[PDB]
Amino acid sequence: EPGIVTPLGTLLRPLNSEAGKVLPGWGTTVLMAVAILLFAVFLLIILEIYNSSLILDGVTNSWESLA
Amino acid sequence: LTYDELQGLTYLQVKGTGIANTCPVVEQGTSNVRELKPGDYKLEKFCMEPTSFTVKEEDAKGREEFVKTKLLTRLTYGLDGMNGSMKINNDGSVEFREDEGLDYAATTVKLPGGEYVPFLFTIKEFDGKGTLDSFSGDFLVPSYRGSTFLDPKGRGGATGYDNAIALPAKADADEIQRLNNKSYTPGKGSAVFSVAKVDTETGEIAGVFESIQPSDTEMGAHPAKDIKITGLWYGQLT
Amino acid sequence: MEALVYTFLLIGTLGIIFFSIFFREPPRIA
Amino acid sequence: MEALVYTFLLIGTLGIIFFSIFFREPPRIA
Amino acid sequence: MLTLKIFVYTVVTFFVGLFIFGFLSNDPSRNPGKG
Amino acid sequence: VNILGLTATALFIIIPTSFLLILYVKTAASE
Amino acid sequence: VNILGLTATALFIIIPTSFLLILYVKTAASE
Amino acid sequence: QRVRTVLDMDDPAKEETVKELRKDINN
Amino acid sequence: SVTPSLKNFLLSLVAGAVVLAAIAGAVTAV
Amino acid sequence: MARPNPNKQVVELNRSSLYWGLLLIFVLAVLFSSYIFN
Amino acid sequence: GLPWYRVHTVVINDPGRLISVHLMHTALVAGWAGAMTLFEIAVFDPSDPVLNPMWRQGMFVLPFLTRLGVTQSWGGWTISGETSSNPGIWSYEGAAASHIVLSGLLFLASVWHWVYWDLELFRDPRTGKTALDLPKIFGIHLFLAGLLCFGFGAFHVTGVFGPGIWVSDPYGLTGSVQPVAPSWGAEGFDPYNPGGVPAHHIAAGILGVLAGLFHLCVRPSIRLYFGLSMGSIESVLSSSIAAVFWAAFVVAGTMWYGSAATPIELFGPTRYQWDQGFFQQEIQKRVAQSTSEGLSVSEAWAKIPEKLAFYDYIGNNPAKGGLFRTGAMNSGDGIAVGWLGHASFKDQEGRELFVRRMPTFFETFPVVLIDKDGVVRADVPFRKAESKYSIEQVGVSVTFYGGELNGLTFTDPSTVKKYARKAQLGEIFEFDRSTLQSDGVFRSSPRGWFTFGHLSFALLFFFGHIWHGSRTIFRDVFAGIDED
Amino acid sequence: LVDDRMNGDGTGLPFGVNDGILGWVIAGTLGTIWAIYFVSQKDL
Ligand code: CLA
Ligand code: CLA
Ligand code: CLA
Ligand code: CLA
Ligand code: CLA
Ligand SMILES: CCCCCCCCCCCCCCCC(=O)OC[C@H](COP(=O)(O)OC[C@@H](O)CO)OC(=O)CCCCCCCCCCCCCCC
C-alpha cells in the first residue's frame, strides 16, 4: 500500500529519493581527512590564543580588547 | 477656519467633523500686532485649542523631561466662548483677564508605560500681564473631582463613609491619605500667551499659548504631575 | 502570580476542550 | 513544619520498604 | 487606520460575497432528498 | 493566600488527574 | 524556604509517583 | 601616574592582582 | 609578524607531523 | 506502512521496578529536602 | 513490553512522528522561552540600572534578549535607564508573546504530523520501504544553517539591517547595543573583541553554504557509509549529541571566563576580575590620576562612578554563592542603595593601612590590615589576650572619601572593626535587606548558574553520546550475542 | 488638534465610505467573486 500523497511531499520527494546511494571505494575520504586536520589546527590556534599559549601582535586577549 | 465661515455652516454639516473643537483662524489681517488701537476692550469669544500635551517625567538614569503622551479622551479638550476684559497701552503693555465661560475641560492622557494622567485643562480666572508679543500670568486650577465624588468604596469628602467599611478591623492610621481625609485643596497654574495675528477691522486677535499646570491629585493622594499644554488661542475685542 | 494561575487554568480548560473535540473516542456504528 | 516533612518522608520510605518486603512480586520457579 | 479600514472592508466584502454567491450556487439542490 | 492557595490548586489539579490517568491508561491498555 | 520548598517536595514526590503508578497499574492489569 | 606606588598600594589589599603578577621579574 | 610563540607553535605542528609519521613507520615496521 | 501505525509498542513496569522507582523518589526527597528547605 | 526508558524508541523508524516529536519539543522550548520572559518581566525592577542591574535580580533570559538588541519594554522603560516612547513590536514582552504564539503554532504542526505520519515522501521510491536520505538531509540542513549564520552575521550584528549587538567599555560603564564592524585580521580571533562575532558568522556561514552544496552533490563512499552507519538515525543522534556537548563546553567556558559575547553589564562580573584586581586596579589608577593633577582625596573619589565601585565588590563575584542558595543576589545581601565611599585606614603613627581582601575560596576570612610595604600592622584578633595587633592597640581610624560618608572620620574601635570587616569584601555599600528579607549570605550570578547548568549538561551529554555511539556500533548484539 | 483621526463617525456616510478607494475595493471584491462564480457556472 502507498503512503499519503501531498503536493508538498511531491515537491520534496526528489530530496529523499536517493537513500543508500554511495560511491565505490573511499571517495573523498582523503580530502575529508585534510579538512579535519586543518580544522584541528585551527581549533588548536584559537585554543592557544584564548589560553595565552599563543601570543600575537594585535591580540590583547583581555577585557581591554573592548577598548 | 475663520469665525465668519464657521458661523456660515450649519450644525448638521459641522456635526461629527471635529470642527466644533477647533479655534477660529484669522486668515485675513496682519501680523504687526502693535498696529492695534489701545484702550479698554471686552474680551469676547475667547477660545483655546491645544496642539500638544506633554507630561513632566523622570526616568531611571536621572533625566527630567516632558514626554509625549497619547490623548485618551476624544475631541473634548477645547475651551471656547470665554469672556473677559483686556487693557492695551500705547507703549505695548497689556493686561489680560478672563471672566467666565467654558474655561475647563477634563482630559486624560496616557504616558508611555500605560499610566493614566487625568487633568483639568483650565484657564479660569487668568490674570496675565506683559506685552503684546508675550504676556504671562496665573490661573486657578480647581480640583478634578468635586467634593461629592465617591471612590469605588464609597468614601468621599462631602459625602461617604470616611473609612473602609468592608474591613471591620482595618480602617485607621495607615490609610489616612485614603480614608481619613479626601482633600480638595485647589491649585494654581502658569500660562504665557503670545499674540501673532490681528485684524483691526473686526478686532479679532489670535496667537499661541503655552501653559504648565498640575494634574489630578486623586483627592489627597499620589502627587500631581506637571502638564505642559502648547496650543492656539483666538478671541474678539469689545 | 495569580494572573499566571488564572491564565494557566483557562488555557488548560481550553486544551481539554480541544482534545475532547478532535481526539474523542469515535462512535462506532457496530 | 519542616520536622513534619522530614518525619513524613522517613515514614513513607519505611512504608515502601515494608511493602517491598511483604508484598513483593513472588519469585516464580514455574 | 485607513489601511486597517481598507483591509477590513476587503475581508468583510470577501466573506459576504462568498456567502451570497454560495447560496446563489444552486443551494436547494444540495440535499440528499429524493425529488 | 499567595502560596498556600497555589499548592492547594496544584494538588487539586494533579491528584485527581493522576487518579483519572491511572484508570484511563489501564482501560486503554485493555482497549 | 518554608513553603516553596514544601511545594517543590510535594511535586517531586507526586508527579513521578503518578507516572510510576500509571505504568504499574497498566502493567498489572495487562498481566 | 606613579605605577610603582599604585603597585605597592594594590599589593597589600590583593597579592594576586595582575599588576603584581606582571613584569615582576624586574623586581 | 611572527612572534616567538607563533614560531614555536608552527614548529610544534611540524614535530607533531613528524611523530605521527614515526608511529606510522613503527606500525609498518611490524 | 498502513492506516494503523505499525510501530505500536506496549510499555511495561513490574512491581519490583515500581518499588525501585518509589524508593528512588522518596530517598531523593529525603536526601534533598534538607537542602531545599535550607 | 518496552521498558519505560525505551518508549521514545517507537519513533526511530517513523520519520513523520519523529518530525512530530521534534515539533512538540520545539513548541515546549519556545513556550518556555516566552513564559520565562514574562516571569522575568513581571518580577524585574528597572528603576536603578546602576546599583540594581538585571544580574543582581536573578534575570536569566533577560540578558540574552538584551545581548542581541531587545532593550526596550512595553512598560515605558529602557534597559539603559532611558525612556522608551515607542518600543515597537520587538520589546521584551513582544519577544515573549512571539515565542508563545510560535509555541502554539508548533504544537498544531506537531499534531498534524503525528496524525499524518504515513507520507509517501518518507517512502523510498525503489523498494517502497520507509527511509531517510540522511547525507542529503544533512546537506540541506547545513546549507540552511550556513545561510542563517551568514545572514545573522552580515545583517543583524553588523547593523546593516539588524540592530547590532551589545558592546561595552572594558569596565562595563557605557554599554549599549551597537552595530559591529567585522575584524578580518588576527584580532578577529580575540575572544574579547566584539568584531570577531560578525567575521566568524560571515566566514562560517560562507563555509557552511559551500559545504552544504558539497553534501548536496557528492554522495558518501561505501567504506565511510558503513563505518559511520549513515543509514541509521541513531548514528546521527550520537554525532549530534557529541557536537552539542562540545558546544556546551565551549559556551560554559566562554561564559565563565568572559568574552565579548558575555558582557558584565548583562551577566555580572567574572570571578577572575576579582582575583586579578581588574576593577580595583582601574579604580586606583583613576584615583592616582587627578591626584597627580592636583585634586584632594575627598574629590577624585567622588569622581569614581558608583557602578565601578559596585563592580569592585566580592558580593558580585559569581563564585561566592552556593548550590542551594536560591534566587537573586538581592535576596542574598539586600538591594544595594548607596556607595559609602572608599575607606582609608590609618594608625596612631599616621601610616596608611589596607584591608587584606577576601579570596574567592574563603567563606570566612580574618580581618588583616597591612601597610604599604607588606607588613601586617593591625587585625581583629581571634585571641584578645597577649595580642599585639588589635585595632585598640594600634589605634586605627578610618576616613571615607567620595560616598555617603565622604569627609567623615571614625576613631572608635567598635566601628573601625565593622568598617574593616566590610572593606574585606571590597568597596563598602549600604544594602536594603527589609524589602526582600535577605538572609545576609552571598548568592551566585546568572553567569555562574549558566556555567553550572551547562557543564552538568555537557557531562551528561558525553554519557549520552557514549551510549548512542555504543547503540549504533553494537546494534546487532543489542538484544544479546549470537551464541555460536 | 493634538492628534489625527478619520472623523468619519456620524454624518450619514454611504456604507461608511469616507474615501472612494473603499467603495472601489468593495466593488472590486464583490465583482471578482461574482466573476469567478459566473465564469464557473454551468459547471455543476
Ligand atoms: C539552564 C538552566 C537554567 C539556568 C542556569 C537558570 C538560572 C536561574 N534561574 Mg531558572 N529556570 C529554568 C532554567 C534555568 N534557570 C527553567 C527550565 C525553569 C522552569 C522550571 C526556570 C524557572 C525559574 C524560576 C521560576 C526562577 C528561576 C530563577 C533562576 C535564577 C536563580 C538561581 C537558580 O537557578 O535557582 C537555584 C537553583 C537550584 C537550587 C538548582 C537545583 C539543583 C538541582 C536541580 C537539584 C538536583 C535535583 C534533585 C534530585 C531534586 C530533588 C529536590 C526535591 C527533594 C524537592 C538563576 C539566574 C529564580 C529567579 O531569580 O527568578 C528571577 C526563580 O525564581 N528560574
Ligand atoms: C574570518 C575568520 C573568522 C573569524 C575572525 C572567527 C572568529 C571566531 N571564531 Mg571562528 N570559524 C571560522 C571563521 C572565523 N572565526 C570558520 C571559517 C569556521 C569553520 C566553519 C569557524 C569555526 C569556529 C569554531 C568551531 C569555533 C569558532 C570560534 C571563534 C571565536 C574564537 C575566539 C573564542 O572565543 O574562542 C573560544 C573558543 C575556543 C577557544 C574553542 C576551544 C575548544 C576546545 C579545543 C575544546 C573544548 C571542548 C573539549 C571537548 C573539552 C571538554 C572538557 C574538558 C574539561 C575535558 C571567534 C568569535 C569559537 C567560538 O565560537 O567561541 C565561542 C569556536 O568554538 N570558530
Ligand atoms: C524566527 C525564529 C526565531 C527568532 C529569530 C528567535 C529569537 C530569539 N530567541 Mg528563539 N527560539 C525559536 C525561534 C526564534 N528565536 C524556536 C524555534 C525555539 C525553540 C527551539 C526558540 C527557543 C529559544 C530559547 C530557548 C531562547 C530563545 C531566545 C531568543 C532571543 C535571543 C536568541 C539568542 O540568544 O541566540 C543564541 C543562539 C545561539 C547561540 C545558537 C547558535 C547556533 C549554533 C551555534 C549552531 C551549531 C550547529 C550548527 C549546525 C553548526 C553550523 C555549521 C556552520 C559551518 C554553518 C531572541 C529574541 C533566548 C531568550 O532570551 O529568550 C527569552 C532563549 O533563552 N529562543
Ligand atoms: C537530545 C539528545 C537525546 C535524545 C534525542 C535521546 C533519545 C533516546 N534516548 Mg537518550 N540519552 C541522552 C540524550 C538523548 N537521548 C543523554 C544526555 C543521556 C545520558 C543522561 C542518554 C542516555 C540514554 C540511555 C541510557 C538510554 C537512552 C535511550 C533513548 C531512547 C528512548 C528514550 C526514552 O524513551 O526515554 C524515556 C524517558 C522517560 C520516560 C522519562 C525520563 C525523565 C528524566 C529522567 C527526567 C525528566 C527530563 C526533563 C523533563 C527534560 C529536561 C532535561 C533536558 C534539558 C535535557 C531515545 C532513542 C534508551 C535507548 O537507547 O533505548 C533503546 C536508553 O536506554 N538514552
Ligand atoms: C572518552 C572519550 C570518547 C570515546 C571513547 C568516544 C567514543 C565514540 N566516538 Mg567520540 N567523541 C568524543 C569522545 C569520545 N568518543 C569527543 C570529546 C568528541 C568531540 C565532540 C567526539 C566526537 C565524535 C563524533 C562526532 C563521532 C564520535 C563517534 C564515536 C564512536 C566511534 C569511535 C570514534 O570515532 O572515536 C572518536 C575518536 C576519538 C575520540 C579519538 C580522538 C583522538 C584525537 C584526534 C587526539 C588529538 C590530540 C591532539 C594532539 C590535540 C591535543 C589538544 C590539547 C592541546 C588540548 C564511539 C562510540 C563516531 C561514531 O561513529 O559514533 C557512532 C561519531 O560520529 N565521536
Ligand atoms: C517534567 C516532569 C517529569 C517527571 C519525571 C518522570 C520520571 C520519574 C521516574 C524516572 C525514574 C524511574 C526509575 C524506575 C526504576 C525502575 O524502572 O526499575 C528498575 C529498572 C528495570 O529494568 P528492566 O528493564 O528489568 O525493567 C523492565 C520494566 O518493568 C521497567 O520498565 O532498571 C533500570 O534500568 C532503571 C534504573 C536502575 C534501577 C536502580 C535505580 C533505583 C535505585 C535507587 C537507590 C535508592 C537507595 C539509596 C540508598 C543509599
Ligand SMILES: CCCCCCCCCCCCCCCCCC(=O)OC[C@H](CO)OC(=O)CCCCCCCCCCCCCCCCC
Ligand atoms: C459599493 C460598490 C458596490 C455597489 C453595491 C450594489 C451594486 C449593484 C448590484 C445589483 C445587482 C442586481 C442583481 C443581479 C442578479 C444577482 C444574482 C446573479 O448575479 O445571478 C447570476 C446571473 C447568472 O447568469 O448573472 C446575470 O444574470 C447578470 C447579473 C449582472 C451581475 C452584475 C455585475 C456588474 C459588474 C460587477 C463588477 C465588474 C466586475 C469585474 C471585476 C473583475 C475583477 C476586477
Ligand SMILES: CC1=C(/C=C/C(C)=C/C=C/C(C)=C/C=C/C=C(C)/C=C/C=C(C)/C=C/C2=C(C)CCCC2(C)C)C(C)(C)CCC1
Ligand atoms: C495552542 C495554540 C495557541 C496557544 C499556545 C500557548 C498558550 C502555548 C504555551 C506554552 C507554555 C506556557 C509553555 C511553557 C513551558 C515550560 C516548559 C516546557 C518547561 C519546563 C521545565 C523543565 C524541563 C525543568 C526541569 C528542571 C526543574 C524541574 C528544576 C531544576 C532542574 C531542571 C532544569 C531539570 C495559540 C493561540 C498561540 C495559537 C493556536 C494554538
